[PDB]
């Protein structure tokens, strides 16, 4: 059958751009019916890898699962969550992506974190984070508690390190700075590990699937 | 903040090259994001893009303006540079210099100085 | 190459009156068009960015819309400040292009 995204574009559908959830599920399509210009998209700004890739690889789908791939409520003892930013806003007040965790610095520190997930369902597990990018060293300092920061993602096909670039860009929804949007596709046995001690959104729901209406 | 200042020769004869320099204050030309950009205004008309350069040494130029453009930087003063070679009168312009941030996702790289200076009129006549 | 063509060149309107400034590209852009405000021997200065974005320090009156092949400021209450001429330009292609030009003046 067909996917409709009604007022949203693929990155906000998942993403999980809070204007993006009224959605009706589905657990399988044929297609991605998709306005030219949709609205709601990524509603914190930034660079959205692969994009394109992830649009094909998600038209055709013969099975959908999201899944609490690190729990919210349980999964980080030493890091607090962001309330919200306002372009990220539903109905009057600041929010974020449902998919993502914006962690943030705890009792003025955010100690390092590694996380893994080892994929033992049977399927492909679509992984997607973020790396913040601060408009200046103060918010960075704000944050996160210290000028520089890393950030690594690494499973068995998947590799690559992050270094946030601090810089005032041009303001988008009233943002002068940056969120990069990335992915990757686990597949059954394998694992992926997140280090950072700091400037990264976290997964929260990723989703196993079927690619292909096969 | 940033302030970028262009400074030059007001008067350049025919045939010879332009040489220009903006200062940069407040920020780093040593940068691996923010990019360089100069842009000029002809007398009587609109603008027209230069070009742009980055530390790492990546470069765009005009292609209007064949090859008689250079753009160098100076990590000591904290500057950047703009060399124009064989100037006619139609080079005769104020001529602007800019800072942009690399931000791919709404810009195609090097394209959307936003930060400019006053500018600096050159004139080219003998 | 991308040629960015402005409409009009020049008006003049009402203090508190809303004005409407085109830009229509040479080819499709998406939404990597920007506009800029220029005043005699000052530095131009970034009002939209990527056509809808406002910037720091820009009042709530200016406006960026469209996307692909049309594009329009709109400046709602116009103020004596707006004296200008505004540029719309593309950051599409590899050589940056910008439009002719709207100058506008106060009518009175």
């Known amino acids: 059958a067909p996917l409709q995204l009604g007022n949203c574009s693929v990155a906000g559908w998942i993403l999980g751009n809070p204007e993006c959830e009224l959605l009706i599920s589905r657990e399988s399509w044929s297609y991605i019916v998709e306005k030219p210009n949709p609205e709601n998209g990524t509603c914190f700004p930034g660079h959205f890898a692969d994009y394109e890739e992830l649009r094909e690889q998600l038209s055709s789908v013969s099975s959908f699962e999201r899944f609490e791939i690190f729990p919210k409520e349980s999964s980080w003892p030493n890091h607090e969550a962001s309330l919200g930013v306002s372009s990220c806003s539903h109905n009057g007040e600041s929010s974020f992506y449902k998919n993502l965790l914006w962690l943030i610095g705890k009792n003025s520190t955010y100690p390092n974190l590694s996380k893994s997930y080892a994929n033992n369902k049977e399927k492909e597990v679509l992984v997607l984070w973020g790396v913040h990018h601060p408009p200046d060293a103060a918010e960075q300092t704000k944050l996160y508690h210290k000028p520089t920061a890393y950030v690594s993602v690494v499973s068995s096909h998947y590799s690559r390190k992050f270094t946030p670039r601090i810089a005032t860009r041009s303001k988008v929804r009233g943002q002068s700075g940056r969120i990069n949007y990335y992915w990757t596709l686990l597949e059954p046995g394998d694992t992926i590990i997140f280090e950072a001690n700091g400037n990264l959104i976290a997964p929260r729901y990723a989703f196993a699937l079927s690619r292909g209406s096969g | 903040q940033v302030q970028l200042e262009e400074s030059g020769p007001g008067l350049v004869k025919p045939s010879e090259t332009l040489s220009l320099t903006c200062s940069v204050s407040?920020?780093?030309?040593?940068?691996?994001?923010?990019?360089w950009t100069w842009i000029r205004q002809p007398p009587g008309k609109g603008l027209e893009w230069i070009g742009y350069?980055?530390?790492?040494?990546?470069?765009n130029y005009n292609p209007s303006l064949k090859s008689r453009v250079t753009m160098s930087i100076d990590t000591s003063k904290n500057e950047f540079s703009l060399r124009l070679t064989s100037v006619t009168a139609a080079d005769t312009a104020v001529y602007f210099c800019?800072?942009?941030?690399?931000?791919?996702?709404?810009?195609?790289?090097?394209?959307?100085?936003?930060?400019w200076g006053q500018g600096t009129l050159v004139t080219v006549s003998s | 190459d991308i040629v960015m063509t402005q409409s009009p060149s020049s008006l003049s309107a009402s203090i508190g009156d809303r004005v409407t400034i085109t830009c229509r590209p040479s080819?499709?852009?998406?939404?990597?068009l920007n506009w800029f405000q220029h005043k005699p021997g000052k530095a131009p200065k970034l009002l939209i960015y990527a056509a809808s974005n406002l910037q720091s320090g820009v009042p709530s009156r200016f406006s960026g819309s469209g996307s692909g092949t049309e594009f329009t400021l709109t400046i709602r209450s116009l103020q004596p400040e707006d004296f200008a001429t505004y540029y719309c330009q593309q950051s599409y292609n590899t050589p940056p292009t910008f439009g002719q030009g709207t100058k506008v003046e106060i009518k009175r």
């Open positions: 080819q499709n852009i998406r939404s990597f």
């Open positions: 350069i980055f530390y790492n040494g990546d470069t």
């Open positions: 800019a800072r942009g941030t690399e931000d791919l996702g709404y810009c195609s790289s090097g394209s959307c100085p936003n930060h």
């Open positions: 407040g920020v780093s030309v040593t940068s691996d994001i923010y990019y």
